[model samples]
Target: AMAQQIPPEVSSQITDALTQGLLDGNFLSLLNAINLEGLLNTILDQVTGLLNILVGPLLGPSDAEIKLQDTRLLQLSLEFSPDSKGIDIWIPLELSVYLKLLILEPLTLYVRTDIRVQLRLESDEDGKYRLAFGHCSLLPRAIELQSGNPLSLPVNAVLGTIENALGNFITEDLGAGLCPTLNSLVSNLDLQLVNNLINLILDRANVDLSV
Candidate 1:
């Protein structure tokens, strides 16, 4: 925004510089410089809030009910990879899922899974933006299952074709709705970047940011 208006080329140059700054250091890099990991963890701690919408039906332990005990982002960072010709992203998540199985007696299980998901970003249909996979898979990197009795393991292993079920679940159910979710996430990121650019322009133009 300006008192009158600026030349198109001048505006474009400033916008591009602001965008570059954001991608390089002004924005995300600032987060990393401060406490991006802590921020992500704080944000992801709310993952269990989606239990009813995501986890409930998404995972129905046979003869048991599952609950999201906790979920947190262990690590998160974004970077541009020259060799990959895209943005290389790494996110590691820690999840604590609990299960209450019914049998001769009620048994509880504490299941922990560590997942490291890697993603690449490329130019989007809109040249101004780049898009990552709308739906990315979070295959388990490591898993630790614990309970009072040894039944959970044998019973889980007994749950025949567990991997197949898991595969089908991702292929059919999880992936079906991931696009919309991811689109919102990506859109928000772009929007934040744009906001930063606007702020920069306003500051350089000697315009009041409060307005």
Candidate 2:
């Protein structure tokens, strides 16, 4: 079982952009229903492979390394309204990862987490766009902790505390670091992929394009 999950700088700039674009109907058709589950799986595999290298000695022996084997967008909704003057995106994601740590002993921990994020569309001065972080949250859980060894009560308690603390740290770290990166990537994507994504949604539903 798994449990489920911004920046302060440049916020006004992003808000202004979102207000303008949404009011101008720049993202009206972007609410098209597009499913990218398969794409996400492939991407996760690629990322995991790259990250696994750290598990080896190539990374100068780190303390702990986490590898995300699977990532899923279990729930997703994208909405935009010129009348509302903004866009709304709700995405609930699931991630399965293996955590390897070398402390008193080498341990492999399997973990699951549910992460939910809300975003709005925004643009920069260069005609670039991004999904700004509206509110970021996370919940993390431990699935299995195994290393072919039994642990004492104290050890279990220590591990449990670390797990909870790490979860909270991750949530905060994402808010501090992930948002700006996402927006930067979105700015790079621009309108190149919007048409296709919106068109795919149109094919699935009878969305009135009269707006």
Candidate 3:
């Protein structure tokens, strides 16, 4: 998803502007201008759709069927990470999984978790910028199972296994799936557009344009 080549000089200037903005808190305003949250939510929606399709086979067996429904992003937030020179995003999510085994009553698994992904911005040798996925983690606040039939010890065991599997699925599969979209988003970001805005603002304020 490479965009048109940016002149090396202009790219360096844009980088300087971004670094200054990050240090002085103007970067947040840039993100707001670009509607970062809205863009992220759209990506999340796409991932949720992927999960609906990917989860069934992972969790289901020959006699058992699994279905994901009512997936929701309860909350989403972005934080600038100075240490990593990147961004940390947290998404709190809730989803219901239906498990039907043979003639037994269907069971509902309610999952609530906060997923955190660390993304670092990197520049290629050709001055192309991309967001690289760093680390992904999840804190499962709750995993509840509900059913018409009384829960048995074996079912409880199965619940624990499901929880673990779900954790792995999110941390591994979900994170891998997000990288391409994030890279594409980064490529699509018009650095020149932001640079022009920053320059205009600085010029209007009569700030020195030494950088």
Candidate 4:
């Protein structure tokens, strides 16, 4: 940060230039405070982490059992759309953690039957943050992604949906709670740590973009 913060007009100019540079080459973007990616990534990482508290019951996945397998940014096929409207990113994931279905109070509490799990998250039409994007299990029939699902999810969107789940889980359940654990895991996994283990280092995107 500058000793004396620059005026917003000057700062805004610098920020724009920085965003452009980051969209093109992130490293150059971060060498200065102008790039928004790192900040955006960090905020998303934090917000997702905080908001995750509401996710399980919110999403139909109950018991606070669901967790992020990985929000690792692995390798962002980072690109800005031609229209410059929204970001188009494909985050490669590797970290795989789950709720593991451990019963809280085995068989007498009985999960309180009458499981009314109709959880869904939909963003406000004007809200860009969570307009985010899922899939069902594959059918016995030969279901081709390009051909859409056998159940017809309107084009093959299963993989993306699963990916969406992973992203949501991270934002909801783990988030910052896993940071210390992540550091330990990184050291433990060492060379094998790819996904979030490695990508957490590049969260600047969340800061720049999410805000």
Best by lDDT: 3
The superposed Cα distance between candidate 3 and the true structure at residue 140, in angstroms, equals 4.9
Candidate with top TM-score is: 3
Tens digit per residue, CA lDDT, model 3, 62-144: 24545564455453444444345445445555756565555445667677766565556555688654555565665566667
> Worst 10-residue stretch by lDDT in candidate 4?
108-117
- Candidate 4: deviation at residue 116, Å? 32
Candidate 4 local lDDT, 1-211, one digit each (tens): 2212223443243234323333444322122222223323433344332433333344322122333222222232322222222222222223332322233211110000010011112235664222111111111111112212335322122233333433443343233333233223222332222222112212323423443
Q: Cα lDDT of model 1 overall?
A: 0.36
Per residue, candidate 2 scores C-alpha lDDT tens digits across 1-211 of 0110012223233333333343343221221212223223333333333444424344433344444444443433344422222333333334343444455344444444443334444456875444444544544533455443544534433244435434643365433444444344334443433332333233222342333
The global Cα lDDT (0 to 1) of model 4 is 0.27
Regions of model 3 farther than 4 Å from truth: 1-62, 80-82, 121-142, 146-151, 154-156, 186-211
Winner by lDDT between candidate 4 and candidate 2: 2
TM-score, structure 2 vs. true: 0.37
lDDT of each: 0.36, 0.38, 0.46, 0.27
Candidate 1, 1-211: lDDT as tens digits: 2233334543354334433433443332222233223322322333233332244455443344444444444434333333332232333334443444444233232222221122233345664434344234434443444434554434333122223333333333333333233333434444544333333344433553345
- All candidates: CA RMSD (Å): 16.3, 15.5, 14.4, 20.9
Residue ranges of candidate 4 with Cα displaced over 4 Å: 1-73, 85-90, 103-211
Q: TM-scores across all candidates?
A: 0.40, 0.37, 0.48, 0.20
C-alpha lDDT of candidate 2 relative to the true structure: 0.38
